[PDB]
Structure 1
Amino acid sequence: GLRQAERNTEDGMSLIQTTEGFLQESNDIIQRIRTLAIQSSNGIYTEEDRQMIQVEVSQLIDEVDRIASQAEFNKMNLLQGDFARGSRATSMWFHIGPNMHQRERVFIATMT
């Protein structure tokens, strides 16, 4: 049981690392959109220029929801919200012990 629990907790570490790596690029995209917004508040730009930058903004949110709805570890979606605090769909646990109830729960909120 101890060997199997060590393997299981290593698997859980892999899952956590995958989720964090997936969140990294979404964070970077959000920072890019914030930079665009800051550079867009100036009054020198006209309506057409703001539409042009809004094109990039639309592409960036499209990418964000693409990562949200396409991130996958083991043919299961993580960032959709299936493991949130109020997850009505399912709950997932990390059995990290050699006994009947030695387990723990991890929460992954919605990231759409």
Structure 2
Amino acid sequence: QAERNTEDGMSLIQTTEGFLQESNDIIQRIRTLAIQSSNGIYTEEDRQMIQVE
């Protein structure tokens, strides 16, 4: 049963991780968007469009 509990623990940890993969790609996407935003000729109106994203 201890082996089983260890395995149930594995699932929590992987489940959590899947949500964190979800978490990370968003940061990577926001970084992509930040680089576009950091372009000083990219306008404020267009930046608001990015800020929605």
Question: Quick one: distance in 2 between partners of 1:27 and 1:46?
Answer: 27
State yes or no: 1:8 paired with 2:11.
Answer: no
Question: Quick one: distance in 1 between partners of 2:36 and 2:42?
Answer: 10
Q: Percent identity?
A: 100
Q: What does 1:1-112 correspond to in 2, within 5 Å?
A: 4-56=1-53
Contact 2:37 2:47 in 1 (8 A): yes
Residues 47-81 of structure 1 show CA distances to partners (whole Å, capped at 9, x for unaligned) of 1101111111xxxxxxxxxxxxxxxxxxxxxxxxx
Shift of 1:45: 1.3
TM-score by length of 2: 0.92
Once superposed, which parts of structure 1, at least 4 consecutive aligned residues long, lie more than 3 Å away?
A: none
Give the number of the structure whose residues are more often strand, by fraction: 1
Give the number of the structure whose residues are more often helix, by fraction: 2
Structure 2 alignment gaps of length 5 or more? none
Structure 1 alignment gaps of length 5 or more? 57-112
Question: Quick one: distance in 2 between partners of 1:26 and 1:47?
Answer: 27
Larger RCO (CA under 8 A, 6+ residues apart):
1
Question: Quick one: distance in 2 between partners of 1:45 and 1:31?
Answer: 20
